[PDB]
Design an enzyme around this catalytic site. Structure first.
Site, short mmCIF file in Angstrom:
data_model
loop_
_atom_site.label_atom_id
_atom_site.label_comp_id
_atom_site.label_asym_id
_atom_site.label_seq_id
_atom_site.Cartn_x
_atom_site.Cartn_y
_atom_site.Cartn_z
N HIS B 41 45.70 79.34 -35.32
CA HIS B 41 46.98 79.99 -35.05
C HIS B 41 47.82 79.25 -34.02
O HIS B 41 48.93 79.70 -33.71
CB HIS B 41 46.77 81.46 -34.63
CG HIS B 41 46.20 81.65 -33.25
ND1 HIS B 41 46.88 81.32 -32.10
CD2 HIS B 41 45.01 82.17 -32.85
CE1 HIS B 41 46.14 81.62 -31.05
NE2 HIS B 41 45.00 82.14 -31.47
N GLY B 143 46.74 82.05 -22.58
CA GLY B 143 46.35 80.66 -22.50
C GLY B 143 44.86 80.40 -22.60
O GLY B 143 44.45 79.23 -22.59
N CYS B 145 42.96 81.21 -25.22
CA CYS B 145 42.56 80.96 -26.61
C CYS B 145 41.97 79.57 -26.75
O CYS B 145 42.46 78.60 -26.16
CB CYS B 145 43.76 81.10 -27.55
SG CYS B 145 44.37 82.79 -27.74
#
Ligand SMILES: CN(C)C(=O)COc1ccc2ccccc2c1
Ligand code: NA
EC number: 3.4.19.12
Lengths: 302, 302
Positions: B41, B143, B145
């Protein structure tokens, strides 16, 4: 979101752990530049634990009595010296993995991570606080002496603790990296006991602010308190006195959440009186005192 | 002595974290040999995320649209492909710090260490269990991820988790390193919720065993029970059923303490039905279920 007792990434410290052997005793040492630091009781025999004369024991040793092993590599000891309760072994190779570092002596209430090691090999990492009675509630088995506690700020590792011993109540005592013990403890196997422990009040308050930041307000009330009245109540639950310094330190969290410090103090008073009534705060059924005001802001805002 | 929630030493994993930027989005990547792994993503805008067609958006990007920074150096992307919900970025140089590793998918109830990162920079490590509802109770800010979960088994890092999203109740969801989600979740900004959770029974028993080893014995009783009668109590209190396999796995602890597993299940039955009577176990007022039998053995004997 979420709130966890997180530790610092341990890799910078892992590259410094070595194994120190003296006679039949093996424990851990910290290898920084060309010096290996370890607890001086590595030179004690069975007969020495009660009343060791470390100056007399150390003068009888040669460099080649100390075996230092870094991974599969033996390091050559070329000098030794005692500084308070730590041995400093001079070795012929500087550690190429030496991080940016400093030595800091911390205060009760301060938190840090411990890298537990056995035979110079790291086993695990967890987060700790220096208790008001200058012990730590760690997790240490035999062979863990010389494991170290640390903080990391950007790329600089601040070493603050070296493990020396476990007291009879199952808690742990040790030194800063200059070899000065935390608290009234000594590296002797005579009777010594930690003082009565207390809860770190300023940390509980910071952790209540963390719960509010993460969206939980059920424990607040409409009351306030004076600082003296709060301390008169909190001491009855074995809570540490809350000082003006602690009030000043909590200022940033007060401003962020909109709740004045003495208003949170009033909520804490009611919590001690009432308990949780089957609820939890940040997933705990007890009030948590091993997050500092600094930790809380750091984990919540980044 | 002592029992702490303990993470694996994180150094082997810190050496693989990089920063991946695509457009305005920056998150974390895992650099192993000459591939960087990150959540797919990263290629989506905020409007793209409402209903993304990943293979279509991926066709529109090229190698140069992916900026990969390993600390201070920019790695050059020379290829890109998707496997399920992870993006695989082929880069020009193999990671010299690549450890021995494997990709493994864990089962609910198993634990792992999470290295929480921001801008490719490791920041914190903590221990997590895969919940029966396939979420984890982590601590992640924007942040994070691309942060990864792992276990270590004799110098081999077993990567098991990559962080993808936070759920509206504040728990977290992610994939294995092959891109397969844990749980019935999708990488789309749609309405998703964690299912009703349950308590990991075998882990609670392991933790009761850890408490006995550490001297906490008050909850032991004269009684014993059967799996069938206990599982009646488990189901009633939203505990996972105890299987015959769980009993065998607990075997070693049942021998090192002299407390049989169904002897211990009788203690747990009594705790579920009656509560803890104002007492704590290993300093907790709740029954802890995020320690596996292996976790207890490695910390309390290994
Ligand atoms: C007490 N403890 C282990 C720490 O404070 C860890 O250090 C950091 C550094 C940066 C962070 C950024 C975002 C969230 C948490 C962070 C934690
Ligand atoms: Na029993």
């Amino acid at each position: 979101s979420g709130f966890r007792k997180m530790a610092f990434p341990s890799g910078k410290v892992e590259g410094c752990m070595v194994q120190v052997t003296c006679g039949t005793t093996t424990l851990n040492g910290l290898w920084l530049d060309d010096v290996v630091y370890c607890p001086r009781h590595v030179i004690c025999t069975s007969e020495d634990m009660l009343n060791p004369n470390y100056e007399d024991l150390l003068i009888r040793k040669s460099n080649h009595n100390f075996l230092v092993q870094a991974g599969n590599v033996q390091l050559r000891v070329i000098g030794h010296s005692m500084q308070n309760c730590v041995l400093k072994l001079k070795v012929d190779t500087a550690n190429p993995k030496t991080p940016k570092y400093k030595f800091v002596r911390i205060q009760p209430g301060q938190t840090f991570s411990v890298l537990a090691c056995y035979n110079g090999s790291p086993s695990g990492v967890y987060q700790c606080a220096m208790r008001p009675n200058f012990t730590i509630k760690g997790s240490f088995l035999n062979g863990s002496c010389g494991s170290v506690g640390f903080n990391i700020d950007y790329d600089c590792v601040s070493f603050c603790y070296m493990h020396h011993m476990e007291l009879p109540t199952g808690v742990h005592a040790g030194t800063d990296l200059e070899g000065n013990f935390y608290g009234p403890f000594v590296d002797r196997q005579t009777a010594q006991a930690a003082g009565t422990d207390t809860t770190i009040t300023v940390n509980v308050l910071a952790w209540l602010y963390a719960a509010v930041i993460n969206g939980d307000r059920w424990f607040l009330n409409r009351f306030t308190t004076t600082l003296n009245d709060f301390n008169l109540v909190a001491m009855k639950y074995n809570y540490e006195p809350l000082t003006q310094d602690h009030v000043d330190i909590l200022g940033p969290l007060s401003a962020q959440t909109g709740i004045a410090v003495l208003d949170m103090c009033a909520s804490l008073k009611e919590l001690l009186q009432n308990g949780m009534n089957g609820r939890t705060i940040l997933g705990s059924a007890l009030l948590e005192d091993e997050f500092t005001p600094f930790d809380v802001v750091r984990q919540c805002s980044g």
